[PDB]
Amino acid sequence: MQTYGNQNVEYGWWSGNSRFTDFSAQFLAAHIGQIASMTFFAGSITLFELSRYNPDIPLYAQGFVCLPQLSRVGFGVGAGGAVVDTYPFFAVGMIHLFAAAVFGSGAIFHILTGPKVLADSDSAASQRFHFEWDDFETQGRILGHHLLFLGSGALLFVVWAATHGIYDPNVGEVRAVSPGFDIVRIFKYGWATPGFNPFFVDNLEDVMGGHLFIALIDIAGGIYHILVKPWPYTERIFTKSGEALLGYALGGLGLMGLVAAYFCSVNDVVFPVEFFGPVLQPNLGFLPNFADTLDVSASGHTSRFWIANFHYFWGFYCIQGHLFHALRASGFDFRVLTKFFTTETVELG
Amino acid sequence: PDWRPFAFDPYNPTGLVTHHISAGIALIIGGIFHTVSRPSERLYNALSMGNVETVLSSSVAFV
Amino acid sequence: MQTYGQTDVEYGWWSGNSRFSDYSGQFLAAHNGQIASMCFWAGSFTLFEVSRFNPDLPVYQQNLVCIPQLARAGWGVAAGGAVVDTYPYFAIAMIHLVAAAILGAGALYGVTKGPKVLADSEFSGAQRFHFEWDDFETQGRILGHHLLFLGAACLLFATWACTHGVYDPVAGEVRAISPSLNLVRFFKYGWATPGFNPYFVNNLEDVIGGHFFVSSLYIAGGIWHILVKPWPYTDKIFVKSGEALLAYALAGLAFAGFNAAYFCSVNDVVFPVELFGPVLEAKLNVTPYFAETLDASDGGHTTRFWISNFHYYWAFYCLQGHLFHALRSYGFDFRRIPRALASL
Amino acid sequence: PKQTWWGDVLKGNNNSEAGKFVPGWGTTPVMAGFVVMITLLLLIMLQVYNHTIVLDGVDAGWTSLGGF
Amino acid sequence: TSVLSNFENEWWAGNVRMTDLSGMLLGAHLCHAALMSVVPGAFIVQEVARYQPGVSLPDQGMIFMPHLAALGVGVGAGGEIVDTYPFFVIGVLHFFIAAVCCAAGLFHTFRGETDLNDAPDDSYAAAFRYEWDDFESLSTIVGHHLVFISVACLIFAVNATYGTGMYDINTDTVHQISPNLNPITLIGYLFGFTPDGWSGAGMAAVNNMEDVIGGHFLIGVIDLLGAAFHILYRKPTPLFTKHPVFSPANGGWSNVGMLNSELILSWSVASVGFMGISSSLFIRYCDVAYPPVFHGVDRTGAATLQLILGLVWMLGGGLWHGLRGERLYAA
Ligand code: CL7
Ligand SMILES: CC1=C(/C=C/C(C)=C/C=C/C(C)=C/C=C/C=C(C)/C=C/C=C(C)/C=C/C2=C[C@H](C)[C@H](O)CC2(C)C)C(C)(C)C[C@@H](O)C1
């Protein structure tokens, strides 16, 4: 944590989650529980949406976030975005619920298994997992393994799109997609030269090639981080503390949330119109909005509207939380703000 | 408001505004001076500025 | 700051910035923050205007300041001064917002983890950048680098105008403009000879030639100041404190702002009518202002009106601040104003 | 003798310099000029109202209301 | 402070406190000139803002435009204002002059040394040391100021004769008029000896631009010669020293030729009042220099205004400061 100066700080229950920042086993338990919550949301919401699905109503008119996402990636969608068979959605949600139960069981296991600290546990092999908030070598290996998992996921997406096929609004029906590979076109999407704009990708072939590239990059980076200790300059720049790593991750997540929010409202290929609804338009009054570009009269809002706005707010407040945690981890205590209207300087490290 | 001499015609309303602007400013200056400047022994003793009755006399005459 | 004689000055929160005047790291941080806010305004109001834009009404009668200027540099206007597409505006605004985020990050760093005093930093690459308010030798090189950036930007604008092309109101479309440049012409403009009033330039070729000349001047000056120390007489002439340099800079900004405001008001080649609107007329009353040649009823006010009127008062109060800080750097105490009356 | 807040604000204006005057004549000479000045001003107005003075193009009567 | 009348240190008289403070006095004069130059430019811009083309200047109530139009600024044949921009340029340039003067006044009031007697011993500024007693010091001041005034008058005349000329009333338009240089004819006006006979208003009965332009050439040359005289000599002569003056300093006429700060101020003030009265006569009668195409025909009000100002300066100020200076000659 931070504990400006004085150690052994006392936290109220409102900020009570900072108590286990030093208990590696409990840290593991909390995060396994959180991942359980995420996958439980996926499965349970899939079923909750299936319960009230109307084939007559267009998919985006009714309030869904999961049926469009499943129908996009194959999974029982006919020609012209028609939900022919509604059983694969049930299967997907059920697998998600089973996974959630597994994760939650692991969470309780670790919360009650042994000592709070993973150094003391006499497993003699769980001690291989005890980490520190100062050592960058172990955290580099951890980063490498997690990048390996992400790259393996991108690879799985590439394979599933190659074999099972995937929906293509330009084609108009589920279709296998050849994995492209053109580093030149990848970099041209990087520059956003006039032909290629990253948020206006038109061919699923380009998307598939980019995903292949991402998988390769993530796997290579994972290997590299597992093998190689961080360089000294990365110790010079970054502080070594838990809240600092939370700050870095929060900044990254806020950026990714904003990117995904903009992606939803604009791209029509990777977010097909028949499932999510017509494209939005970005407005800026006091705060950014996404206008539906459609008469909300007797149609509510398209699912794309909800996804885009929710993730704009998620990204913005992840940025604000990143600022808060980076300010703390660098050394700034906000209590000094109370000295604003006095003659004492409102400033410290 | 117009500061040309015909604003002194009492039947032309453009004078009134021209008055209350200029005279208004004249009072503000006249206020500021008296908010700072002290009286003079000569006048202070002659008019008995320490006695409110002189203020009453002068105000009644003005009214 | 001035701090007449007295040391350990107490500044109320209403005058709070003076506190960090004597720390260099915080100084840098504050100015990174300021330019970040400027860039943020640029991007944010590009987006704001685009969000409140109708491709139907005249551009100038709609309250806009960023779309007309972006159009004047190309980017969305084809012919006749009508904005066709809007996406390049959005892209420019996004880049401005991202740059603002980066600069604000630099500022926030300078506040917290950066050294409060650069000279006291261990890095010793940071000790290079430390400066003192009384040393004109170092401030000369700072000036030189900043002049280099200014001149580079001016040259970039010139080349963009030449190659990509800017709006040409005489031509009525976006044109690539060749520079019509001759030193005799520019001295004619400087002396305001009867055929050449610099506020009434008629051909953008002369504008871009002048920009090439100005970029050359700025680059030359930047190299000169990086290489050449200020002369001894400058110590006799100028004052040595932060407030003094602030006064000089405020004077320069006031001069530039008056020129810009008048330029906007009277010229109609740099500011095409279809974008910014009809030309304005200077009008003095108790205070100066520029008024529309065409009727302002039913059309609010044109972009030209807002730009020129705003910058006139920006320049005027920058001049007033220049006087204030000059007198402060002269050791004149304003506590004399509410003191003299007490004595009388 | 309540020590109110508003009394604290206004006591300096009430009687900080109570009973103080500058010796001699002070500004009294200058005042003289001002009086004479207004003694002309008012006088002029009276005559303008009286039609003793006729300013050029200034018809002191109901006809001057023309323009409203 | 170099005076002990009764009320030297009174705030309403506080300007007398700069009687000897040379630097502050210079700053005060510069700031005052800033005022005097702000007014014309500001009011010219204000006038041009409300100028209407169809109506003539005398019916618009403009009090700075007529004097500019008299010099051919923005007017054409027939004496009608064509273009208004040069008036605006004149106003802007007066703004520039005022800003420079105000900058100088601010410098000398605060940054500059208060008393030039405290200058660092020939630091480009001891050359500007002056004292209200030594004659030599003030002689060079008078000489250089005469240089500037003479150059201005010569410039006016040269412009009139060669470049773009002036609006000649008789020829009805702007012309480079050929000057008249008959010195006896010009200096005759000073006694009223106009060619058409003696006239009551001296110098004001000129009926042609040639007379005025020749007179300006004569005045410029005379003032240049006087500038040379005062700059190059600086020494008192039996004209100033040893001349009769009547004063209660010594009851009855004396040949002392006294010198003092209030006395110099009084002579200057009397001179200004006299110029005011002369200009009163000029605008009353001389309509060559004031074409009624611009200033109107009836001009009694402006002449009366000039008369009042001239009487206030010549009689009031001149007498007040002369009496104070003569009384201060009891030191
Ligand atoms: C208006 C004329 C003027 C100009 C243009 C000008 N200054 Mg100043 N100026 C400075 C910089 C400056 C810069 C960099 C600059 C160039 O652009 C200028 N100035 C320019 C500082 C070094 C120095 C101090 C600057 C300083 O501390 O400024 C702060 C001043 C103000 C009014 C802020 C109030 C503005 C907001 C409406 C209110 C905010 C309330 C808030 C939302 C609520 C709480 C929020 C929180 C809880 C989260 C300075 C001064 C000062 C003055 C004065 C009178 C001026 N100025 C005047 C000017 C000081 O007293 C003062 C001085 O020196 O007195 C000791
Ligand atoms: C610079 C610096 C720092 C900052 C460091 C940071 C935060 C740097 C920021 C780095 C960023 C933002 C990196 C972002 C990288 C983005 C990547 C790599 C994008 C990859 C996207 C791909 C591969 C898209 C792929 C496809 C996917 C999709 C289908 C498209 O249709 C097409 C297609 C196929 C191209 C500090 C502050 C930490 C320390 C400082 O001292 C130094």
Ligand SMILES: CC1=C(/C=C/C(C)=C/C=C/C(C)=C/C=C/C=C(C)/C=C/C=C(C)/C=C/C2=C[C@H](C)[C@H](O)CC2(C)C)C(C)(C)C[C@@H](O)C1
């Ligand atoms: C004398 C003095 C000083 C000086 C004080 C001052 C006032 C210094 C002022 C300096 C100024 C105001 C300099 C201004 C210079 C203006 C310039 C150089 C104009 C340049 C324009 C150029 C180069 C081209 C412009 C175009 C280019 C543009 C693109 C269009 O195509 C039109 C066109 C062709 C006019 C100090 C400060 C040194 C000391 C003081 O105490 C007293």
Ligand SMILES: CC1=C(/C=C/C(C)=C/C=C/C(C)=C/C=C/C=C(C)/C=C/C=C(C)/C=C/C2=C[C@H](C)[C@H](O)CC2(C)C)C(C)(C)C[C@@H](O)C1
């Ligand atoms: C020194 C002295 C004193 C003072 C005496 C006084 C009052 C002396 C007066 C001195 C004066 C008034 C000198 C002024 C002289 C004026 C001159 C020489 C004006 C010349 C102007 C000319 C030649 C211009 C002429 C034209 C030029 C003009 C442009 C017009 O196109 C008209 C036209 C063509 C006439 C006392 C009182 C102290 C004691 C005395 O005994 C002696």
